[PDB]
């Protein structure tokens, strides 16, 4: 037992709260951003060659929820943004919505 790891509880709380300060956002966006950033923290992704596997595992965990959230459509908008930032290939964006169901 080494009482130390990458995820400090108080941090997860603080970031969500800080997100909620923003006025000019829809719940269909804030929920997404949080659900993602938390999983980002949970594993510590650095290398760009990871981002493909990243979104994969992301829905691999949060499948039931976004469905239960009925929020997959904004998930796809996020996929768009991320490809726009040159980290996704089109060869996987769809593949996500595929694995989704």
């Amino acid at each position: 037992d080494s009482e130390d790891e990458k995820d400090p509880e108080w941090l997860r709380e603080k970031t969500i709260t800080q997100i909620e300060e923003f006025s000019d956002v829809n719940e269909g966006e804030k929920e997404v951003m949080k659900l993602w950033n938390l999983h980002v923290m949970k594993h510590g992704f650095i290398a760009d060659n990871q981002m493909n596997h990243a979104c994969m595992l992301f829905v691999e965990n949060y499948g039931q929820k976004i469905i239960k959230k009925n929020l997959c459509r904004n998930f796809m908008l996020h996929l768009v943004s991320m490809h726009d930032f040159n980290l996704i290939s089109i060869m996987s964006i769809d593949k996500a919505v595929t694995k989704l169901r």
Binding site: I19, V25, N37, L71, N74, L77, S81
Partner: protein
Amino acid sequence: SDKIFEAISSMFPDKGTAEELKEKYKELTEQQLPGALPPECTPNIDGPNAKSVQREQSLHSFHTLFCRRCFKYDCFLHPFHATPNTYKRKNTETALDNKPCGPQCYQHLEGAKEFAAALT
């Protein structure tokens, strides 16, 4: 307005500014609000209130929020002053194969199957 704002800022460290003075001036002159979505209300996709809007405003928030390096929204160690996803990319990096897309195929209908090359 200006002198009154300065006097209020002097008498109060809590206010301490004419910026909040003009903010309250605008809140009292108009006294109305479009919505939680910006003054250009951008309702969500996954919700009932839909409104077809161009691509830019659809991705505006996402662009105006992302921090590329840490791959997170609101980098806690990156200032957000930067350039958006407005950049260049390879416009021709696909397969580009014509096929019967199905019964209601875009191809397999010489109107659209030829207008595609026409629209090229």
